[PDB]
Amino acid sequence: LDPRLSVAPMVDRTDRHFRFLVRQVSLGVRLYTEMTVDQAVLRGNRERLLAFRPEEHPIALQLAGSDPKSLAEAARIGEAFGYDEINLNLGCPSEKAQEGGYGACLLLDLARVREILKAMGEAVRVPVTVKMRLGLEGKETYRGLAQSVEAMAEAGVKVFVVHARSALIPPLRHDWVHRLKGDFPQLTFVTNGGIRSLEEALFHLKRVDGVMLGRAVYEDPFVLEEADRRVFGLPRRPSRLEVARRMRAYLEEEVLKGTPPWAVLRHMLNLFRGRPKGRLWRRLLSEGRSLQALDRALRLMEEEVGE
Ligand SMILES: Cc1cc2nc3c(=O)[nH]c(=O)nc-3n(C[C@H](O)[C@H](O)[C@H](O)COP(=O)(O)O)c2cc1C
């Protein structure tokens, strides 16, 4: 597992269509599914919920839940679909996450978290990792955070993705994640929260093992343009037009397979953010919502940049 760079799990954003797009920008970057509740994996349409394209590797499935055997079975299912990693959400503070007794709620029961992670780790051969917050607003202490990490490490976890803000406006404390690395040199820490550029990511990579970017990537996928070269050492550099042409081929195939065109197009609106004709690109796709509209938008862009 190369922990250096990942795109954050984002419900309603990081579905297989957006993940496919990001993969065209960076071959190296690790992708994460939207938070996927264990009960939905167990009782829902598993193929529809979990199937993904081989190009999306490396990819982690993020699960949420509260019961060891349920999460272990959901992890087995995720492993069967080919996921490279099973990530446990320990950071969701939403109203839903509270009623369901998962996400950030669980940190208040380290004993249970421990039993969950042991069960999950024994169930699958791929890595089981965690994504967590700094703590629950009010009683955020570094000692508490470290106590939580130590407990989860006893359960076998090695990779910790830490969204470096307390949950419930509490500030980012990336320094705490830097401190964690100092206290637990043998574990892997990926910091997350408010990182808006690759340059900012490289700043943090000097202190921790990895950086996870969420919102900045959805706002402008080409924030990752230099990642393959500057982070992964690959002699590769994407162009927006090349990515768009690859997305056109993907859309054509997906619509024939029964995918509504907007399911794909809604995630392509920012491909030319800040570029000449960037706003026209967005309007054309938003108004047209079809392969034909994408074709029109492509032609105008190809005339704009050239060859
Ligand atoms: C639209 C949206 C959806 C999110 N959904 C998830 C999720 O499914 N699982 C999760 O762990 N965090 C989720 N989060 C929290 C993010 O993964 C991430 O930790 C947070 O946005 C901070 O990183 P960023 O500043 O780079 O975006 C979501 C955030 C946003 C904005």
Side-chain angles (χ1 to χ4, degrees), residues 146-205:
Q147 279 167 344
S148 291
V149 163
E150 169 64 21
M152 293 187 283
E154 291 177 12
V157 177
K158 294 201 167 312
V159 177
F160 296 80
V161 179
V162 182
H163 180 183
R165 192 178 299 204
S166 286
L168 186 155
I169 306 162
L172 288 155
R173 299 192 188 282
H174 285 295
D175 63 318
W176 284 16
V177 191
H178 307 164
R179 191 177 308 160
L180 280 181
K181 183 64 187 186
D183 290 343
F184 298 89
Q186 83 278 4
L187 304 175
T188 295
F189 296 94
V190 176
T191 204
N192 167 248
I195 298 165
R196 303 283 304 174
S197 74
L198 196 67
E199 298 92 301
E200 292 197 339
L202 293 164
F203 173 90
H204 291 283
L205 285 172

Side-chain angles (χ1 to χ4, degrees), residues 8-11 13 35 62 89 131 163 192-194 213-215:
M10 293 176 293
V11 167
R13 294 184 172 189
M35 185 188 61
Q62 185 186 71
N89 179 310
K131 180 162 178 291
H163 180 183
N192 167 248
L213 292 86
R215 281 168 297 178

Side-chain angles (χ1 to χ4, degrees), residues 7-11 14 32-35 62 87 89 131 212 214:
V7 179
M10 293 176 293
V11 167
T14 60
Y32 279 73
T33 67
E34 305 160 278
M35 185 188 61
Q62 185 186 71
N87 177 250
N89 179 310
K131 180 162 178 291
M212 174 178 275

Side-chain angles (χ1 to χ4, degrees), residues 34-93:
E34 305 160 278
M35 185 188 61
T36 304
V37 175
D38 59 354
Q39 182 68 21
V41 176
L42 295 163
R43 186 172 67 99
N45 185 331
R46 301 175 179 170
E47 170 76 13
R48 187 173 57 82
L49 283 168
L50 298 176
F52 66 87
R53 286 203 184 193
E55 290 88 349
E56 294 170 55
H57 292 289
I59 180 166
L61 171 65
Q62 185 186 71
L63 296 174
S66 61
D67 172 66
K69 295 178 52 172
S70 294
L71 282 159
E73 178 71 6
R76 289 196 269 271
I77 293 169
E79 184 182 48
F81 275 95
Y83 288 94
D84 297 297
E85 163 191 336
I86 307 299
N87 177 250
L88 178 64
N89 179 310
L90 294 171
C92 192

